[PDB]
Design a protein around this nucleic acid. Structure first.
Ligand SMILES: [Mg+2]
Ligand SMILES: [Mg+2]
Ligand SMILES: [Mg+2]
Ligand SMILES: [Mg+2]
Ligand SMILES: [Mg+2]
Ligand SMILES: [Mg+2]
Lengths: 147, 145, 145, 147, 145, 147, 143
RNA sequence: AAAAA
RNA sequence: UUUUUUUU
RNA sequence: AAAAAAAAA
RNA sequence: UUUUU
RNA sequence: AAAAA
RNA sequence: UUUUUUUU
RNA sequence: AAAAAAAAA
RNA sequence: UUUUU
RNA sequence: AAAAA
RNA sequence: UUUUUUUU
RNA sequence: AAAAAAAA
RNA sequence: AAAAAAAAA
RNA sequence: UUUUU
RNA sequence: UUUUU
C-alpha cells in the first residue's frame, strides 16, 4: 500500500506474522564436471551444496531439470557430443539423452526433465545422472528447488 | 506436465548464468533493549547462517517492522519506537505503536522510499529502537545482493 | 459538519503515532555572493528556527531555484548560475538565467532526479552560486526528515 | 512538469513567488497526562507546544478533535474508563463523553469533535478539556492546526 | 522547412542557458585481465578526451556490458564474469556469460536499479571482471553530469 | 526490457554492437561578443569550440539557427537594437535581420534560421554572421550540430 | 537521386526583368519640438532598401514609433497626419506611451482607392512628437 | 511542408 | 488562405 | 468531467 | 475533503 | 451536509 | 430514513 | 474477470 | 504457472 | 494438460 | 491433430 | 508511352 | 495505428 | 529515388 | 520531428 514518496512513511503493522528464517529457494546451479572418453560419470548431488552457490546451508534439494553442455574442445577430427542418463534412488533410468554438435568449434548440448511424480529430495550422497562425452569436461545447469 | 517419465529437453546455446544471485527476504531476529536507552540495530545481524545469508556482504533494506518480544512493566502498556538511520543523514522520526491490551504486543513500522534504498554493510545501522519491554522482535524486508 | 455543538467520537484502539514527523517545505533564504567567485550554499542554512526546522538534522533536497536579490552592476543585466553538488560526486552543470530588463531579477533552477535524492546534513553543500549581483535569493523545495 | 530522468534538469523559473518561511501545520499530537481518582484534570494547551513535537516555534493552535486513551491499568476488580469535558474560552461545556473498557486488560477510549463554529485559536495559558478516569495516567491524541 | 533562403526568427526574451549540460553516453573501452585474478574497472576510464568527456568529473552509471576481446586459452571456451561494486556496499553477484563457439566472444551484462544510480568519481570502481581471456571490452551506458 | 526493481539484474547481452567513442552532439551555445558603434563584427565559428562548452574535441559544426540579444545598456536617450547578417562560405548574404527594444531598459533581440540546403560544416577559421548594434556587447545563442 | 534532373521546357515564357515588390521599409526621421515634419516619399527609394531602381510606390499603411527618449517628466507621444496629392487630411492619429521608458506607437491604414503612386518629391504624412527621432515602418508596394 | 508583406 | 514575383 | 507527495479523514 | 511543495 | 436516541 | 425538541 | 519485485519458464 | 517479500 | 516418432 | 502401444 | 533495369 | 531519458522545437 | 516512359 | 542510450 506504499510506494512513490521521498521520505520515510509509517507502516501500521499488526500482529506478529508467520515467519521463516530459513526459506526455500528455486535455483539454476552452474557447475562443471570432468568426463573421460568412453566412460560414464555419476554426477553427485553434493556438488549443488556449496558456499559458491549460497547453498551450503541446505541438506536436501528437489531437482526439476538437467541441462548439459560440453565445456572443452572435442578430439581431433570429431564433433562434440554429450549424453545424459537420469538416475533415481527408486530406480535408475536407462535412457541416454544425447546431443551432438554440427560444428566442431561449437558445444554439444542436451537435457532432460524430471516428471512431477519423480520430484523427491536428494542428499549429497545421491547422484543426479550419468554423463558421457568425448570432451574432457562438461558444463551443467540444473534447475532445482533447495529445501 | 502430467507425464510419468523423463522427457528430453532440446537445449541450445549455453545461457547466461549466475551462481551467486540476489535474494528478497524477510529476516526475523530479536534485540535487547534497556529502559530509556535507544539501541542501534546493526545491519550485521541480517548476515547469518541462521538466515542462509552468510555469503552476502551488503543489503538494501526496504522496510522495518518491530514487535515487543516480552511483557511490559507492571501497570504499563507495551510500546515501541523506531528512528530510521541513514549513512547520508540520520532522521529524527519516532514512529511509535502502543498496545491497547497489557497482554498484547506493541507494533509499528516504517517504509524506506526508493530514493533512500542504498546498500548497507555490517558496520552500518538501520534504526534506533526504544521500548519499555526488554526485547523487541523485528521482521526486516530487504534485498540481499 | 454544519453542526454547532461538540459531538462524540467513538474511538477504538490506540493508533500508531509519531510526534516528530516529516515535512515537505519550500525554504526561502538569501546568500551573499562576490564577483567572479562561486559561493557554496551550505545545507545548514535550511535548519533554523526561522523556518520551524531547528528540530531536524537531515534533509532531502528536491529542487533549487535562485533569484538575484540586488541590482546588477552599471550597464549590465543580471545573471545567476547554479552548479549542483553531491556527496557522491559534484556535477559541472552551470544552469544560467539572465534578465532581459536591467531592473528585473535573473532566475534559474534545476531539478534533482529521484536517484539522487539522498539526505544531506548541515556540513554538506547543495550547489555553487555565481552572479554579478551581490546577493541571491533561493527557494529550495525539500523534504525534512 | 519534471519527473523520471537520471540527471539534473534545468527548471525555467520565473518571477519570485509568494513565500512563507513559517507556514501552518496540521498535526496529531500524542502526549500523556496523569489523572487522579475522582478528580478532574484540565489539560493545558501549552502541552502542545514543545520541541518534542517540532512545535516550539508556535504560539497558537486551532484544535479540531480530541481523543483519549487510558495509559495505565485500572484499580483492582475494576474496568477502565475515561471521560472528556470540552472547555472553551467563550464558555465551558458540561458534557462528559465517557468510554469504558469491556476487558479489564484493555484500554478505555473516548473522543469528541469541535464544530467549525468553535474552532478558534488557543494559547498555552488556555485549556483543552477536563479528563476524568480511574487510571493514573491517560494518553491523548489531539488533531489540531498549528498557526 | 523546404525553404532555400534564410528566414527571420522573432525571438523574445533571453532564455535559460547551460554551456556545460549533461550527456547520456555508451562508452566503449578495454581492460587487461589476468588469469584467476579479478580486475577492478576504474570509473576514471570513462573520463577521457577520446570520449569527449574530459570536461566531466562525475558520472551516473546505468548498465555495464562486457565482451571478451581476445581468444580464450587452448581447448577452452571464452567466459566473462561481472561483480557490481558500489560505494555503499559491494555486491557478490557474478553474472557470467560463456561462449558456445571457441571462436566467438563471451558476453554478459547487468543493470543498475534506479535506487542505486548515484554518481561515481574517477577514484571509484564500477565492477570486477574475471575471464580466461587476456582482454575484455566493455560498453558502459552512463549519464555524464 | 528492464526497469523497476531494487537490485542488480542480469542482462542477456549478445554480439558486440556498433560503437562510436566520439559521437555527434546537438547544442545551443551561449557566448558573448563585444560590438562597436556603427561597425559590424564577424562572429568567428571558433568561439563555438571550447572546453567551456565541452566542445574542444570538435573541429567542425553545422549551424542551424542564430539568435542574438543585446548584453549591455544602450547609449543615452536611445533604445537598444541588434542586426544580424548571415555569412556563408559559398556566398555572404546581404540581409540585416534587425530587432529593436521598445523599452530602453529591455534587451533587443533578433534571429535567423539557416535553411537545410545551406547547412554545411564550418571550421574555426570561418564566420557565422555579422553583428551590428549600439550596445557595447551582444549575447548569442547558436543552435548547431557539432560533428 | 540527390542529383540534378532535366526540365522539359516549352515555348519562351512571358518575362519581366524589373517586377514589383511588396515591402515594409524601416527608417527614421528627425523631429523638432512643436513642429510638424513632412516625411518625403524619396526616403523610400534608397540602396539601403534595394529600392534605388524604383521611381514610384503605392503606400498601404504607415506605422510610427518614437526612437529617442522623451523630455524629463514627460511620456512619449507621436502623431501622424496623412497627406495626399488629391487633398491633405486633417487627422492627427496620436499614440502615447504609458511608461516613460517605453516607445509611443501609432499608425493608420490607407483605403483601397486612395492608394495611388507617389514619387520622390511627394510627401506621405506629417509627424509630430516630443521625441526627436521618430522611427517609421511603412508597408507599401514598389513599382 | 517556397520568400517579402 | 490578403496581395506580388517564383512555382503544376 | 487534467500530473503527486508529506501531516491530519 | 483540510493543508504544505 | 443540525443535536440526543 | 425509527421517534422527540430545533428547523422551509 | 485487483498493486510489484527477486531466482527458476 | 512455481516460489520469496 | 501421457511416451517415442 | 501423421501413425503405434497405454489410455473413457 | 501507363512497367521494368542499377542504388536505397 | 508498441516501453523512456538526455541536448536542440 | 537516378535512367527508361 | 532532429539526434544520444
Ligand atoms: Mg564439446
Ligand atoms: Mg555455431
Ligand atoms: Mg484504563
Ligand atoms: Mg481487547
Ligand atoms: Mg541593448
Ligand atoms: Mg520589458
Amino acid at each position: 500500500t506504499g510506494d512513490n514518496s521521498n521520505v520515510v512513511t509509517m507502516i501500521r503493522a499488526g500482529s506478529y506474522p508467520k515467519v521463516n528464517p530459513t526459506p526455500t529457494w528455486v535455483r539454476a546451479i552452474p557447475f562443471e564436471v570432468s568426463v573421460q572418453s568412453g566412460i560414464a560419470f555419476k554426477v553427485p548431488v553434493g556438488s549443488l551444496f556449496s558456499a559458491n552457490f549460497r547453498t551450503d546451508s541446505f541438506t536436501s534439494v528437489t531437482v526439476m531439470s538437467v541441462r548439459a553442455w560440453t565445456q572443452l574442445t572435442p578430439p581431433v577430427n570429431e564433433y562434440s557430443f554429450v549424453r545424459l542418463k537420469p538416475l533415481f534412488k527408486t530406480g535408475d533410468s536407462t535412457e541416454e539423452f544425447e546431443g551432438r554438435a554440427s560444428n566442431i568449434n561449437t558445444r554439444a548440448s542436451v537435457g532432460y526433465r524430471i516428471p512431477t511424480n519423480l520430484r523427491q529430495n536428494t542428499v549429497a550422497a545421491d547422484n543426479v545422472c550419468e554423463v558421457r562425452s568425448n570432451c574432457r569436461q562438461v558444463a551443467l545447469v540444473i534447475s532445482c528447488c533447495f529445501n
